[PDB]
Amino acid sequence: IYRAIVTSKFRTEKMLNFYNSIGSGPDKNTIFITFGRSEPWSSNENEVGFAPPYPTDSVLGVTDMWTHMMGTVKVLPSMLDAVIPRRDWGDTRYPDPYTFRINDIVVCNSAPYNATESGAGWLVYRCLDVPDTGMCSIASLTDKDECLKLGGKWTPSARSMTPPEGRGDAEGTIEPGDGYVWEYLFEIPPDVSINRCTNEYIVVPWPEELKEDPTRWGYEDNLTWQQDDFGLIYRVKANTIRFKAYLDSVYFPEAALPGNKGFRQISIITNPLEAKAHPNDPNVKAEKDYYDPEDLMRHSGEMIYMENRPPIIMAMDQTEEINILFTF
């Protein structure tokens, strides 16, 4: 009777809501990362290939996380980046370095096999069309239009000759002539590619910082902002946030003593409350940038993420980077 669905765009929207909800007051959320568990999982926890057991999503699991909690750190907006799968043009160290499909988002100018414009950071492009000669995900369909009309994924047999370059047409269209067609999307500045992007992911600017400094992301020429309001994240189906947070022992010396056993758990709690002199006292949203677990109220807030890992030892004046992915 009923035939409905939610679009790919909704996924990007749940991501933005999450990112945008972070702030202060009763309508916003405060996000904290917790670290804990100084006692071993088992005597083999330090051997290569060791996997610790999965955390348990139950009231017991939450209680356990709190009982072993050693410290907490407030997560700020600037610690969160929207990201998408990284696909480098011409990287002959991975399959299909010269073959792509409609909608693939490829990165150029990020390695010698990519080089196209000394003076520009990494450059990202979306494939708009491919050669008419190839193979369809649905084998029997040997015609591109037929393939695509039925919903098959066409993979061309004619390789991409040269990597796209420049910002293309007034519409961003680029025609290398090898039968491929590309659309310039944006640029990634070095401070970002160098410290925020990884082997598997690239950053895609949030709408606000984009609208704020179009030139920083080589976006000054874009016109689509007249309709999609600098919604680059929706244009590329971004639906994953990556945290880049830090644990500074300077703030938890009592747990970074010369021979401590390290920490093995990480979790994310939204809106934990502050500790209270008397249970019936008013609730206070924890907003300082860090807390000793005992200065927070036990079991308050909502534990939305739980992670167990092999131990990692903290030194008196060192810092541990914590990364975490949220797919929406």
Contact residues toward a second copy (CB under 8 A) are 1-10, 12-14, 17-18, 20-21, 26-27, 29, 49-58, 62, 151, 208, 223, 225-229, 231, 234, 266, 270-271, 273, 276, 279-281, 283, 297-300, 302-310, 324, 326, 328
Q: Which is nearer to Cl ion, 260 or 270 (CB)?
A: 270
Selection from Cl ion, a second copy, none that 266 binds (CB < 5 to 8 A by kind) is a second copy
Amino acid identity at 261: K
Helix or strand (DSSP H, E) at 135: strand 134-136
Tell me if 199 sits within 8 A of 219, measured CB to CB: no
- Distance of closest approach, residue 258 Cβ to Cl ion, in angstroms: 30
Going by C-alpha positions, the residue among 1, 22, 190, 181 that lies closest to residue 103 is: 181
- Distance of closest approach, residue 57 Cβ to a second copy, in angstroms: 5
Q: Decide: is 99 part of the binding site for Cl ion (CB under 5 A).
A: yes
Q: Which is nearer to a second copy, 9 or 288 (CB)?
A: 9
Distance CA(251)–CA(319), nearest Å, equals: 10
Q: Which is nearer to a second copy, 13 or 143 (CB)?
A: 13
Stretch that binds Cl ion, among 3-11, 161-169, 175-183, 308-316 (CB under 5 A): 3-11
Q: Which is nearer to a second copy, 34 or 109 (CB)?
A: 34
Selection from Cl ion, a second copy, none that 99 binds (CB < 5 to 8 A by kind) is Cl ion
- Distance of closest approach, residue 80 Cβ to a second copy, in angstroms: 14
Q: Decide: is 281 part of the binding site for Cl ion (CB under 5 A).
A: no
- Distance of closest approach, residue 281 Cβ to a second copy, in angstroms: 8
Measured in whole angstroms, how far is the alpha carbon of residue 222 from the centre of its chain?
A: 24
Tell me if 174 sits within 8 A of 181, measured CB to CB: yes
Selection from a second copy, Cl ion, none that 10 binds (CB < 5 to 8 A by kind) is a second copy
- Compute CA distances 11 → 66, 137, 228, whole Å: 31, 25, 16
Cα dihedral 139, 144, 145, 148, rounded to 10, equals 60
- Distance of closest approach, residue 102 Cβ to a second copy, in angstroms: 10
Angle in degrees, CA 216, 322, 265, rounded to 5 = 160
Stretch that binds Cl ion, among 54-62, 148-156, 214-222, 250-258 (CB under 5 A): 54-62
Structure tokens at 203: 């950053």
Burial class (CB in 10 A: 0-12, 13-18, 19+), 280: exposed
Q: What is the DSSP letter of 177?
A: S
Q: Which is nearer to a second copy, 17 or 137 (CB)?
A: 17
Strands 201-203 and 80-85: antiparallel
Q: Decide: is 22 part of the binding site for Cl ion (CB under 5 A).
A: no
Q: Return the residues of window 208-237 that contact Cl ion according to CB under 5 A.
A: 208
Amino acid identity at 171: E
Provide the β-strand partners of residue 105.
Answer: 126
Q: Decide: is 293 part of the binding site for Cl ion (CB under 5 A).
A: no
Selection from Cl ion, a second copy, none that 308 binds (CB < 5 to 8 A by kind) is a second copy
Locate all alpha helices (DSSP H) within 178-319, ordered by sequence: 190-195, 207-212, 225-228, 232-235
- Distance of closest approach, residue 146 Cβ to Cl ion, in angstroms: 16
Number of shown-chain residues binding Cl ion (CB under 5 A) = 20
- Distance of closest approach, residue 309 Cβ to a second copy, in angstroms: 5
DSSP 3-state of 113: coil
Query: Token pair 């969160």 is at which residue?
Result: 80
Angle in degrees, CA 71, 318, 193, rounded to 5 = 100
Please pick, from the candidates 84, 148, 181, 297, the single residue that binds Cl ion as defined by CB under 5 A: 297
The footprint of Cl ion (CB under 5 A) covers 8, 16-17, 20, 58-59, 62, 76-78, 96, 98-99, 195, 206-208, 275-276, 297
